[PDB]
Amino acid sequence: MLKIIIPTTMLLPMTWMSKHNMIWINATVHSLLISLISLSLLNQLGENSLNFSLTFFSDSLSAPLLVLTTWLLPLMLMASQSHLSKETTTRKKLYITMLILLQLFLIMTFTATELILFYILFEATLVPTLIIITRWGNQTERLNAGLYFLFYTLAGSLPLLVALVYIQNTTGSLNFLIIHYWSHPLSNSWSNIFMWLACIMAFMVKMPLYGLHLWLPKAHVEAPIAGSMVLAAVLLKLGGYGMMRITTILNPLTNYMAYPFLMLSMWGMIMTSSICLRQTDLKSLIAYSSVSHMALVIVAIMIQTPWSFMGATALMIAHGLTSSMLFCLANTNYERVHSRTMILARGLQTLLPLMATWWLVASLTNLALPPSINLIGELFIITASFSWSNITIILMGMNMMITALYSLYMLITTQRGKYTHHINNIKPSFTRENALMALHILPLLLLTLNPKMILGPLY
Amino acid sequence: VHIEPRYRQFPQLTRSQLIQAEFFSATMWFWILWRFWHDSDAVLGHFPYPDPSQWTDEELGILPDDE
Amino acid sequence: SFPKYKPSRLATLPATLDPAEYDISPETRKAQAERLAIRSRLKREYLLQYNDPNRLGVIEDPALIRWTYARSANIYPNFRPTPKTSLLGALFGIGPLFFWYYVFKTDRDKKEKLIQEGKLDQTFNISY
Amino acid sequence: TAALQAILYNRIGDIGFVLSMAWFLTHSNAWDLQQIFMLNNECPNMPLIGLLLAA
Amino acid sequence: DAPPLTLEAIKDRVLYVLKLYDKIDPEKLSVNSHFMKDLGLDSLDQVEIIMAMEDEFGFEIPDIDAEKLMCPQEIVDYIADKKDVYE
Amino acid sequence: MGAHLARRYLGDASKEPDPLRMPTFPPDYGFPERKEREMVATQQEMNDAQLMLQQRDYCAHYLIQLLKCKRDSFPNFLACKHEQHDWDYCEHLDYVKRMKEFERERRLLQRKKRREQREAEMARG
Amino acid sequence: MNPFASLTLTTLTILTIPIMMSNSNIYKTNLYPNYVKTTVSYAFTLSLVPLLMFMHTGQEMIISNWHWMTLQTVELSLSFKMDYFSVMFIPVALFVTWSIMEFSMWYMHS
Amino acid sequence: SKMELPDYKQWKIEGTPLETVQEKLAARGLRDPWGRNEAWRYSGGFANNVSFVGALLKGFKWGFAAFVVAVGAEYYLESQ
Amino acid sequence: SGYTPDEKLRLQQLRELRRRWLKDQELSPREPVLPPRYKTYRHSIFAVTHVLIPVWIIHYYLKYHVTAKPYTVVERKPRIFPGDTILETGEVIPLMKEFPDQH
Amino acid sequence: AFSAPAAYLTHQQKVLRLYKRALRHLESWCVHRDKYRYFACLMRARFDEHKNEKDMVKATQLLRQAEEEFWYGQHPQPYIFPESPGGTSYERYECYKVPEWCLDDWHPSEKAMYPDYFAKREQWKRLRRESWEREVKQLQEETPPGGPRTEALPPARKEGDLPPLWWHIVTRPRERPM
Amino acid sequence: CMHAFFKAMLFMCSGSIIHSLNDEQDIRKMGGLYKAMPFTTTALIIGSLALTGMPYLTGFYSKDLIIEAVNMSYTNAWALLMTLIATSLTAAYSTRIIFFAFLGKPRFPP
Ligand SMILES: CCCCCCCC/C=C/CCCCCCCC(=O)OC[C@H](COP(=O)(O)OCCN)OC(=O)CCCCCCC/C=C/CCCCCCCC
Ligand SMILES: *P(=O)(O)OCC(C)(C)[C@H](O)C(=O)NCCC(=O)NCCSC(=O)CCCCCCCCCCCCC
């Protein structure tokens, strides 16, 4: 994994030694090169994972997330160069450095072979994100959003650290291969119940679980465009990856401790879709859509079947791409009119045609339209939940109906209708914005063409 | 063909559309009459419906009540 | 005479059938004039800013800002824990959870009982 | 409004369709007509009502 | 599709309708004659005239605007302005 | 539709036949010597012709002949009138046999009612 | 090879063809409606041919040309069931669409 | 081009149901002044119209003749 | 009840301005200044490409790739009637028995 | 839509609007022209019967009774003109209406494609920019110190002036833009 | 198949009427089109006759068999009665369309 880690640690000096007018060009070009290099990890084995060394390893679950991170970095660079034109050169370099550090920590997190190193890195992802939010956010609420995000995540994660050190003391190793080959059943006792609670609650807060999600609207709405893109695409997937990795040793206690979390996830998925139906803010609408999708992923992981894990992985990748695209579209419209109210700007279908096409495609992918990988993952999760029980179909159907309703409501409100009469600063869409949308959408359709690359180890 | 608009008057028609409408209506009625002539059993039926009250107990296998 | 029309919540009373429209006090006319004056002042401000040749941007709407602020940020500071709020919150945030837990637990208990008794049609059920 | 209404009603139909698809996969290990017809010698109410709702 | 309207066509059609009205003598009817002052009609007659023009031209004139159309020339100008007729 | 529905519903269901339970009497009850129905087409022939299982009744041979005639004279889709009429006539005969069965069931039921009424009267006397 | 599968898949592909031409000067000009209508008519005739094939011998087939993915013991592949229903509905739908597209060339001129 | 409106003096309610309406109103003591403006519809080429049964028999005249000719041709061909 | 003099004057002025604006909206004889840069023949060129090339590609794909793995293309077995000739083995499927003919 | 509304509807305006609405719904009921003419003449006879009334209280009572009768007897599916708010062709062309501020963002090549139109557009823009100060001064001169009590706007009181707040009224998109 | 044919033709005739009468979709405003528009009139009459089950048109070979199967099967009595009433109401609304669109005097703008 050093052939991918070291190029980022070289991107840092490149950013800090480039000329003032070439920082964005250099960062984008070399981020795309690093993504191309990281595409090699998709060649996975059918029996075991790719164990590079004693510290880093790659799996059919880690590879798509790493590729998504490496592909997402240049898009964040494009959006940031859009909205940071008046900043000084030093602050531009600092912003690029924060993005690079976040990507490096995410790569090391997804490739870490030991639970304690994984914990250290996935906690280290907070600092660049908090700095980005609380420093380059636009509104007054960025400080409160950062506080909420940081303290929710840390209150979740500290008992996870205690549980990890206790597991190390009890068993002798936190290496994932060792804890998988030497896994032993977890007897039904209060101590095991609380260990299960510590681990699962940390990752549920990271997911986020319904009832533990307020930090997500707070942070996503108030963060800059790059922060919003990375929060939804990758940082939300740390919880799912951790739960997939950590549930090896939690059986058979997961068969009994999953009921409250399953009920919370299903009913909160319904509730957050309904909230999306009546949202006066576009970023809030997208954030609650993210909450619903991650609640579905939580349901899949908790029911814990080979068919659910594949759907969970596919839904994670598809939701990451779709949420990044939706946040980018909302940011473009915000840069037009300097306000996040959804009904302020209308008639954008007749004011900006190709951007309306991008909106339509993003909304179509947001709802499960076949044969998109969104639909593939959602359908796999729905079928696994149907096998689990036969009223999960009722809940999933209600969620799908409300999902289509709010997606098309957002599309119609933002695009259809008649344009606002007094808004006359909506310039034609930039080549940069259109290229950003194209780079968001085309990989989604290519992954639809080749679906087995994002179905996880269980395929 | 250029058709001038009329004001409060019957519109200008064309011999082509007149004869086409007449031809297709005549075609429909000719087809209906021709079909009713040849296979009339498609409307009136072909096989008589038996009257079960006229079937005898001998052929229906019903013995005398006293026996 | 003719059957009466009963207004509802989702089918309101028509203006022509409102009894208040046929009992017009001189105070009502003054109130209507005041409302028209308020609307005219707002319309004049909007039209001036809208027809200004040098304006390039969005005319900020304080009413829209107040609406979006009240819908989002001004809810919690004005929330007081009352019996009505407590009961509604408890119901709408707990009852569905326990209801679905009961439903799914009963369903899974029946399924497990059938599996243990060995009289459940599990043939061809390969994928799970 | 008409477009969104059509989407809503067809999405309830899709709820039924997804119910039928999930039942067929779980109880027949296939999503194709050949194996569905082979294995379902007496098709049950849940998949058939799902199909009816979708239709 | 349809041929465009003209000021002359609008005026001819409105005068046609008004001359087919039986409470107006066509000889003393001109494009500037007022319905009330110099034609001798009343509010109900004006409402009927506006409804007749709505039927003639296939579009509805709102009641707030219909009350002020007191002249055939005013009706012509209103209809031309709404239909974007400039020649 | 029909008078039988009226008789059974607004009347004596005991004297009217049950369509789901018919026949309720032995096939030879009243028939001293009764002949089994003759099937012309064999199971292998019907399977090769791939007749629908709804179409594999006692009139299957005429259907097979009609299909063979239709396949051979493809462009002339009006050359199978005789075969179609033969198949329809066989189906008509099958239907009138079913009608005879219904009528036999009805009159046997009312005969049984008369017999049991007479026996009850004899016991009462 | 039997012309059945080839002709059916060809009708479907030639239906798809004018969409690939939607990023061209023909899509920019005013010949696109007539182009689409002509393509639909050609597809209609090319689909009438397998209907003639079925009306004679009653041929029905399934075409699982491309294998999409194998989910453990469940294989999903791009399969087309060319049976009586398909070979009878396709020519009717194509005929109706051809007529509708010409009527739309007249009706949607403006 | 430059269509001309037909002379307005030709529109008369006479011979049309509007005259019957006018007679009823006169018996009531009333009059309708918009008689002619509606009377354009009842004259010209719209004066004669077909009933519903007549509309369905639009091509029955020629259809029956063609059917008779075809039946005769078929009979003659069958005979010889 | 009618236009006030101010309303009528403003309406007249606005109508004049609107008509002038529309007249200006009218184009010029040379206005779209563009930058420098048989029926059977068209039917034949369309038919060869749009029909001939795809059918060639599809037949090549089916004959040599799709019909190279088992069960990809499965034809329903032909219907066999009595009194027929099976072509593969030169077999004679025999006739049915005599019918109890009615009239 | 072109007239500024008043603070209230007078009794005459109310009864005239009721008359027109009742005639329209009666025409919806009486499809045929002669029948509609007959019943419309009867309706106008009723209105003439109640035309002269010295007691305004009784006139208002009669108006209320007539409104109740109309609401009971209205056509559930009345005729609406296609361009009217309830019509089938209402707001169909609102997506084709594009403004001149969108127009002025064109590329120089697109502008050069139409040389003569943009010269007149620049003349219009100069006319707009040379009159705004006069328009706003005229508006603030005539309005009362309290503020505008109605939405009416004044004409141009001078020979070299344009009526204030005219740009969007004059340059509103055409009824059939594309 | 049969319904596709004749219902598509009926909708096309309705669209032709709408386009001729300047986007007017009200039968209360249509009228006189029997002679105003001959070809669309005869096409709509043929379509309505086929829809209602003219004894030898396209709709006869499906609707008549459907009705016979409904009558001759072990069906729900209420379902059978509602099917018959629906057939009668089909004839009724076809009559309404023809009567208010083609017969009588014009009601469209002059
Ligand atoms: C299984 C899941 C549950 C299924 C039923 C749940 C129904 C939930 C209703 C959805 C809530 C709506 C959220 C927002 C939707 C969009 C807002 C909206 O109301 O749309 C307005 C729009 C406008 O109405 P118009 O008649 O067109 O008038 C226009 C006048 N200008 O109205 C609609 O589109 C709403 C239509 C759906 C409403 C609900 C109706 C569904 C209820 C029927 C369920 C029973 C089905 C029985 C099954 C029978 C087959 C076995
Ligand atoms: P012009 O300014 O001359 O107008 C004269 C007016 C009417 C303004 C008078 O000056 C006036 O105000 N007169 C006194 C007030 C008055 O006339 N009140 C009574 C009028 S309302 C009335 O009489 C209506 C009764 C009949 C119509 C009722 C409508 C109900 C039928 C509709 C059915 C729905 C479908 C047909």
Automatic annotation (TrEMBL), chain B:
Query: Where do the coiled-coil regions begin and end?
Result: none
Q: Cellular component terms, GO, for this chain's entry?
A: mitochondrial inner membrane; respiratory chain complex I
Its main subcellular localisation, reduced to a broad class, is mitochondrion
Q: How does it sit in the membrane?
A: Peripheral membrane protein
Question: Where is this gene product found?
Answer: Mitochondrion inner membrane
Superkingdom in the source lineage: Eukaryota
- What keywords does the record list, in alphabetical order? Electron transport, Membrane, Mitochondrion, Mitochondrion inner membrane, Respiratory chain, Transit peptide, Transport
Q: What does this protein do?
A: Accessory subunit of the mitochondrial membrane respiratory chain NADH dehydrogenase (Complex I), that is believed not to be involved in catalysis. Complex I functions in the transfer of electrons from NADH to the respiratory chain. The immediate electron acceptor for the enzyme is believed to be ubiquinone.
> Which protein family is it in?
Belongs to the complex I NDUFB2 subunit family.
Quaternary structure note: Complex I is composed of 45 different subunits.
How is this protein named in the record? NADH dehydrogenase [ubiquinone] 1 beta subcomplex subunit 2, mitochondrial
Taxonomic source organism: Sus scrofa
Q: What is the lineage of its organism?
A: Eukaryota, Metazoa, Chordata, Craniata, Vertebrata
Write the span of the intact protein that is present: 52 to 118 of 119
From TrEMBL, chain I:
Write the record's keywords in alphabetical order, separated by commas: Acetylation, Electron transport, Membrane, Mitochondrion, Mitochondrion inner membrane, Respiratory chain, Transmembrane, Transmembrane helix, Transport, Ubiquinone
GO BP of this protein: mitochondrial ATP synthesis coupled electron transport; mitochondrial electron transport, NADH to ubiquinone
UniProt KW Lipid metabolism keyword:
no
Task: Please indicate which superkingdom the organism of origin belongs to.
Answer: Eukaryota
Q: Where does it localize?
A: Mitochondrion inner membrane
Q: How does it assemble?
A: Complex I is composed of 45 different subunits.
Its recorded name reads NADH dehydrogenase [ubiquinone] 1 beta subcomplex subunit 6
Q: Which organism is it from?
A: Sus scrofa
| Residue numbers of the full-length protein present here | 62 to 187 of 188
From TrEMBL, chain J:
Q: Does Transport count among this protein's keywords?
A: yes
**Main localisation, per the record?**
mitochondrion
UniProt domain Complex 1 LYR protein: residue ranges: 13-71
> How is this protein situated with respect to the membrane?
Peripheral membrane protein
The UniProt keywords, alphabetically, are:
Acetylation, Electron transport, Membrane, Mitochondrion, Mitochondrion inner membrane, Phosphoprotein, Respiratory chain, Transport
Enumerate the transmembrane spans: none
Query: Which branch of life, at top level?
Result: Eukaryota
Q: Where in the cell is it found?
A: Mitochondrion inner membrane
Picking any one GO biological process from the record gives:
mitochondrial electron transport, NADH to ubiquinone
The Gene Ontology CC terms held by the record are:
mitochondrial inner membrane; respiratory chain complex I
Residue segments, region Disordered: 135-164
Function, as annotated, reads: Accessory subunit of the mitochondrial membrane respiratory chain NADH dehydrogenase (Complex I), that is believed to be not involved in catalysis. Complex I functions in the transfer of electrons from NADH to the respiratory chain. The immediate electron acceptor for the enzyme is believed to be ubiquinone.
What is its quaternary makeup?
Answer: Mammalian complex I is composed of 45 different subunits.
- Annotated family: Belongs to the complex I LYR family.
Spell out the protein name for this chain. NADH dehydrogenase [ubiquinone] 1 beta subcomplex subunit 9
Tell which residues of the whole protein are contained here. 44 to 221 of 221
From TrEMBL, chain K:
Task: Name the domain of life.
Answer: Eukaryota
What transmembrane ranges does the database entry give?
1-18, 39-57, 77-103
Kindly list the places in or outside the cell where this protein is found, as annotated in its UniProt entry.
Answer: Mitochondrion inner membrane
Q: What does it do? A: Core subunit of the mitochondrial membrane respiratory chain NADH dehydrogenase (Complex I) which catalyzes electron transfer from NADH through the respiratory chain, using ubiquinone as an electron acceptor. Essential for the catalytic activity and assembly of complex I.
Q: Which family does it belong to?
A: Belongs to the complex I subunit 5 family.
Full protein name: NADH-ubiquinone oxidoreductase chain 5
Native source organism of the sequence = Sus scrofa
Shown portion of the complete protein runs from 330 to 439 of 606
